[PDB]
Amino acid sequence: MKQYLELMQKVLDEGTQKNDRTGTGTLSIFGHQMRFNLQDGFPLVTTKRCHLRSIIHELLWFLQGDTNIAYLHENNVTIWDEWADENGDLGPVYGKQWRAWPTPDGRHIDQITTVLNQLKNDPDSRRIIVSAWNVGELDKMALAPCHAFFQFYVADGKLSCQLYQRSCDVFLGLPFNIASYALLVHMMAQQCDLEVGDFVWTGGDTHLYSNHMDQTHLQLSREPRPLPKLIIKRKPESIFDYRFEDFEIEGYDPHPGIKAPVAI
Amino acid sequence: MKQYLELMQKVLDEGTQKNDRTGTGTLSIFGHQMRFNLQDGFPLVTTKRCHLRSIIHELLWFLQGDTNIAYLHENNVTIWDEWADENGDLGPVYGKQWRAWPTPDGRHIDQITTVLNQLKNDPDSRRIIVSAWNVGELDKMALAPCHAFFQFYVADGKLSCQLYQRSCDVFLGLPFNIASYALLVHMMAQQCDLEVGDFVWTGGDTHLYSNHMDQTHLQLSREPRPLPKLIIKRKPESIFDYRFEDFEIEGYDPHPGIKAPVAI
Ligand SMILES: O=C1OC(c2ccc(O)c(Br)c2)(c2ccc(O)c(Br)c2)c2cccc3c(Cl)ccc1c23
Ligand SMILES: O=C1OC(c2ccc(O)c(Br)c2)(c2ccc(O)c(Br)c2)c2cccc3c(Cl)ccc1c23
Numbered sequence: 001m002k003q004y005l006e007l008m009q010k011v012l013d014e015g016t017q018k019n020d021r022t023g024t025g026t027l028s029i030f031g032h033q034m035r036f037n038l039q040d041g042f043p044l045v046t047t048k049r050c051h052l053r054s055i056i057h058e059l060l061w062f063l064q065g066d067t068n069i070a071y072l073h074e075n076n077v078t079i080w081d082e083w084a085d086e087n088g089d090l091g092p093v094y095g096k097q098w099r100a101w102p103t104p105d106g107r108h109i110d111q112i113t114t115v116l117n118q119l120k121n122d123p124d125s126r127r128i129i130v131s132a133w134n135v136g137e138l139d140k141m142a143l144a145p146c147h148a149f150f151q152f153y154v155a156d157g158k159l160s161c162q163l164y165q166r167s168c169d170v171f172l173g174l175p176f177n178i179a180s181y182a183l184l185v186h187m188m189a190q191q192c193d194l195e196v197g198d199f200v201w202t203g204g205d206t207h208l209y210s211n212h213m214d215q216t217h218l219q220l221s222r223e224p225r226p227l228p229k230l231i232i233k234r235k236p237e238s239i240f241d242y243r244f245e246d247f248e249i250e251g252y253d254p255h256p257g258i259k260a261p262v263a264i
Numbered sequence: 265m266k267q268y269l270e271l272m273q274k275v276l277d278e279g280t281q282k283n284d285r286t287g288t289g290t291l292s293i294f295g296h297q298m299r300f301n302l303q304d305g306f307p308l309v310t311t312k313r314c315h316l317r318s319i320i321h322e323l324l325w326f327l328q329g330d331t332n333i334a335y336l337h338e339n340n341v342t343i344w345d346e347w348a349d350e351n352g353d354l355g356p357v358y359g360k361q362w363r364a365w366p367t368p369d370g371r372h373i374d375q376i377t378t379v380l381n382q383l384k385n386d387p388d389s390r391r392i393i394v395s396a397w398n399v400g401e402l403d404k405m406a407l408a409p410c411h412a413f414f415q416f417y418v419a420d421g422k423l424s425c426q427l428y429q430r431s432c433d434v435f436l437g438l439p440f441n442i443a444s445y446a447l448l449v450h451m452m453a454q455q456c457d458l459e460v461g462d463f464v465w466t467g468g469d470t471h472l473y474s475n476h477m478d479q480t481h482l483q484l485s486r487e488p489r490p491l492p493k494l495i496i497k498r499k500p501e502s503i504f505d506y507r508f509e510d511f512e513i514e515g516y517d518p519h520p521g522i523k524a525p526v527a528i
């Protein structure tokens with residue numbers, strides 16, 4: 001899509017050359033922001049084929065708060081395999097913080113229920129926030145949260161959300177990340193009887209890996225196509241009762257997929 | 265400043281009529297970002313006179329990590345008076361989280377020292393972050409953090425920083441907030457022997473109060489003037505050893521101050 005391709009081009013034109021944790025070099029920029037009016041269509045990249053299966057399962061998995069990959073495995077979703085230990089545990093990553101942020105006094109805070117309580121009883125609140133950046137638990141996590149913190153906003157009967165992504169691989173991760181949060185907004189909006197507003201993506205270290213340059217130029221040579229439409233075939237009794245089959249993408253006609261390998 | 269006036273105009277043209285904490289109505293937008301190349305001069309608004317005295321004392325106070333207002337009072341800084349209790353305590357706000365974030369196991373994490381350690385040993389890290397959004401301690405704070413978290417970035421020998429502000433009164437608080445963080449970047453850069461890069465400001469609920477409309481129109485009618493230059497007269501042995509007198513602003517020639525009252 002337009003916003004995405006503009007960012008890719010920006011990284012190419014303005015990015016500075018610098019490596020990553022003892023590894024592949026990158027071109028990076030710091031601080032960028034894109035806005036997607038969800039009423040204009042579901043923001044699933046069209047300049048390359050993207051699959052939503054893993055994205056949907058991962059989101060349902062996050063919402064359940066259990067950080068063991070068992071559920072992902074039961075559905076043959078392997079995106080977290082390289083980070084899980086022999087027992088399938090990842091430590092207190094995303095889901096754990098979203099649903100059970102541990103306090104110093106022994107309590108566990110359900111931020112998702114909190115946000116829903118706020119959207120229902122105090123929609124104009126300026127602190128409808130969910131943070132996964134639990135400083136005291138970073139060392140126990142298989143990896144530090146990338147999509148670290150998001151905030152909701154309501155105006156004119158529409159639900160908007162802004163995500164702060166501290167680090168972003170523009171080619172591989174960004175499309176996935178945008179789709180994931182767009183889905184969450186639709187789900188939250190359905191549960192609150194609200195229309196969807198804007199999804200605002202804000203990035204920190206936004207980069208392109210040196211070995212994805214040809215892939216980037218190829219995708220930039222393609223014209224974005226009309227965005228698909230997200231359909232939720234059922235209204236669950238709560239944000240925790242959604243099922244994989246409840247989602248359907250309509251009118252998605254992307255260009256062919258583009259493979260982008262990674263170093264180890 | 266150009267960026268600041270543009271945001272102010274944006275709120276006026278695109279803002280939605282939204283009410284706030286049972287009180288004064290506002291015009292608000294959600295999600296915006298501004299960039300200040302600190303190499304172009306210190307970002308202290310010139311379309312209205314702004315005083316840095318309280319801003320400097322508050323930052324030094326944040327860095328010391330003590331949340332009692334005693335130090336502020338010793339220097340006749342009264343900006344936190346309305347939120348402090350009879351003993352002058354504010355609960356675990358900003359400073360406490362920056363310097364002693366409590367973990368579930370009883371430890372207290374010094375995020376400022378952590379960040380300095382990162383800038384010195386691993387400047388390319390994509391997780392040089394400080395967060396004041398401690399979910400488990402929000403209820404104990406006099407007020408929920410507004411400038412909720414920030415991230416540093418290093419490229420070409422320059423230090424940049426991006427702040428996420430969840431809520432922002434564009435007229436009264438923003439100028440203060442921008443100056444505060446710009447000062448922090450200068451201090452951090454001096455300690456790490458780096459040049460100053462960009463300060464990126466990202467906002468959540470960005471608004472203008474209905475009773476500040478005349479004041480806004482007045483400031484918008486004024487032409488911004490060349491930005492001043494920040495001078496640090498001494499290089500302390502550490503980020504915690506700065507003193508009020510170490511700072512000096514050169515070439516600040518602003519338009520007259522504009523008073524903006526608040527309801528109670
Ligand atoms: O670990 C991943 O893997 C894939 C991946 C795909 C092809 C490829 O060449 C490489 Br490298 C990686 C991924 C994505 C969806 C899937 O259904 C499967 Br399976 C795998 C992936 C693509 C895009 C974003 C991803 C993010 Cl944000 C996290 C983890 C993965 C990830
Ligand atoms: O609590 C404040 O007060 C002042 C303030 C000034 C005039 C006025 O009409 C009203 Br209302 C409030 C402020 C600012 C600097 C000072 O030296 C002193 Br004293 C007071 C203020 C101005 C701009 C930003 C502020 C922020 Cl972000 C926090 C707290 C204050 C604050």
Ligand SMILES: O=c1ccn([C@H]2C[C@H](O)[C@@H](COP(=O)(O)O)O2)c(=O)[nH]1
Binds near residue numbers: 174
């Ligand atoms: O949702 C995600 C998850 C991971 N990554 C990327 C970011 C970096 O490319 C790499 C992680 O490196 P660090 O930021 O942790 O240093 O994986 C993303 O872009 N988006």
Ligand SMILES: O=c1ccn([C@H]2C[C@H](O)[C@@H](COP(=O)(O)O)O2)c(=O)[nH]1
Binds near residue numbers: 125436
């Ligand atoms: O650094 C600061 C501190 C406070 N405020 C403002 C934001 C809102 O105008 C009000 C706080 O309202 P809530 O976000 O808490 O609802 O004070 C700022 O703009 N900047």
Ligand SMILES: Oc1ccccc1Br
Binds near residue numbers: 052053054252
């Ligand atoms: O395989 C797919 C194709 C299009 C959209 C989602 C999936 Br998953």
